[PDB]
Design a protein that fits this description.
The chain is built from six helices and 26 strands. The protein is mainly beta. It folds into two domains: 16-148, Beta Barrel (Cathepsin D, subunit A, domain 1); 149-390, Acid Proteases (Cathepsin D, subunit A, domain 1). A six-stranded mixed β-barrel has the order 2-3-8-4-7-6. It has a five-stranded mixed beta sheet with strand order 12-15-23-16-22. A five-stranded antiparallel beta sheet has the order 14-13-18-19-26. The longest helix has 14 residues, at 230-243. The structure holds ligand 1BS and zinc ion (ZN) (3 copies). Residues 1-384 are extracellular.
């Protein structure tokens, strides 16, 4: 796992990528690690923000599946042609596998200026793969074709350059301190988990806990922010405003639309509260908490103008598709995606962004006598209901 330590790079707010090779002879590309989707897709035609891309004509091992795929996002899209080719991870396991690859032939708002990834590695499950769940995701081919154990772990360390580690097939004990706590993968589609309680500086938000998981909660390395369902987000902002009320920020700040600044090195970190999300434990009635510092959810943005000011963006935002535990949360922790045991572990990261008097933490157990089920059951559409899964 020493070969895999430090195999991630990225830019702040543009995710983390790992090198991969596609084709023979191998074409090296920088690929976004995305635990919130399930396609392996690579830029495969010229684009003004890419200077390399997968050229299927140069790969003697490439085979066309003769099927297109179209992937809309709320903010953009990619589309392309499905095929298979040999794939390896130069700073990962010593193996090569034959994987599905979507060659992206057109896209809109997907490849960003001065972003240096040329593709996306969807690490989530077949159920959310496009065009449907019969396109086997990369990690499933990896595991089926080799002896790599069915698990990977991410150490995401906090435009400024960022680094981290994806350990494929293992847990590297040098990347965390202290205890490793597991929460169940509630269902294998996204990496879905259940939050049972939320506290802001030790004060319970006191919502029905189903609200925390409406309509799901997921661990997502392809999302920058901590995103929270609307009602949860409003209660959180109310509570963070109350703690920081010595400072009156504009509304655009709370929307993530405006930076706020203090004189160099003077930021009053101590007026911003910690946030603790309690995740359901492997034992009924148990939970454990992960505790986020302001230094994780206030993200520094280097000011081209005001020179000796430290300026920050608020990186908690609204969601209408459940809680999203993005970079803001993952950057505190070493996150173990234990697919074999259908669970996600959290430990304090060996690279966490500390504070004078407080630390990102993973702590448990907390027991409740309270039964309550905090999971939300998504209303089943007639479209979902009809599809056969043979
Ligand atoms: C995986 C990936 C590329 C999928 C994606 C597709 C498109 Cl078309 C536009 C943006 C994104 C995207 N957005 C992330 C930020 C990002 C961009 C590039 C690489 C990694 C992460 C995101 N995070 C938020 O917190 C967020 C919050 N609100 C709205 C949209 C948001 N979008 N992530
Ligand atoms: Zn480059
Ligand atoms: Zn059938
Ligand atoms: Zn199916």
């Amino acid at each position: 796992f020493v070969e895999m330590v430090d195999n991630l790079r990225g830019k702040s707010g543009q995710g983390y990528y790992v090198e991969m090779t596609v084709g023979s002879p191998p074409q090296t590309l920088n690929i976004l690690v995305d635990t919130g989707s399930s396609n392996f897709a690579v830029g495969a035609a010229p684009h003004p923000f890419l200077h390399r891309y997968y050229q299927r004509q140069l790969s003697s091992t490439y085979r066309d599946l003769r099927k297109g795929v179209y992937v809309p996002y709320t903010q953009g899209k990619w589309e392309g042609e499905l095929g298979t080719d040999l794939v390896s991870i130069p700073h990962g396991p010593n193996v090569t596998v034959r994987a599905n690859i979507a060659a992206i032939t057109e896209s809109d708002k997907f490849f960003i200026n001065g972003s240096n990834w040329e593709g996306i590695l969807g690490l989530a499950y077949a159920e959310i793969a496009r065009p449907d769940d019969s396109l086997e995701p990369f990690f499933d081919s990896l595991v089926k074709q080799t002896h790599v154990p069915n698990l990977f772990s991410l150490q995401l360390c906090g435009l400024a350059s960022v680094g981290g580690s994806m350990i494929i097939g293992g847990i590297d004990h040098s990347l965390y301190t202290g205890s490793l706590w597991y929460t169940p993968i509630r269902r294998e589609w996204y990496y879905e988990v259940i939050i049972v309680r939320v506290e802001i500086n030790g004060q319970d938000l006191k919502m029905d806990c189903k609200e925390y998981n409406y309509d799901k909660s997921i661990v997502d390395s392809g999302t920058t922010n901590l995103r929270l369902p609307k009602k949860v987000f409003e209660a959180a902002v109310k509570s963070i405003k109350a703690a920081s009320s010595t400072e009156k920020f504009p509304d655009g700040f709370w929307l993530g639309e405006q930076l706020v600044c203090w004189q160099a090195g003077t930021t009053p970190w101590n007026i911003f509260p910690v946030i603790s999300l309690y995740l359901m434990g492997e034992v009924t009635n148990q939970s454990f908490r992960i505790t986020i510092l302001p230094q994780q959810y206030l993200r520094p943005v280097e000011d081209v103008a005001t020179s000796q000011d430290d300026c920050y963006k608020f990186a908690i935002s609204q969601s209408s598709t459940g809680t999203v535990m993005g970079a803001v949360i993952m950057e505190g922790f070493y996150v173990v995606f234990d697919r074999a045991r259908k669970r996600i572990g959290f430990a304090v990261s060996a690279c966490h962004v500390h504070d004078e008097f407080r630390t990102a933490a993973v702590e448990g157990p907390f027991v409740t006598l309270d039964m309550e089920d905090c999971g939300y059951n998504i209303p089943q559409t007639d479209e979902s209901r009809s599809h056969h899964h043979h």
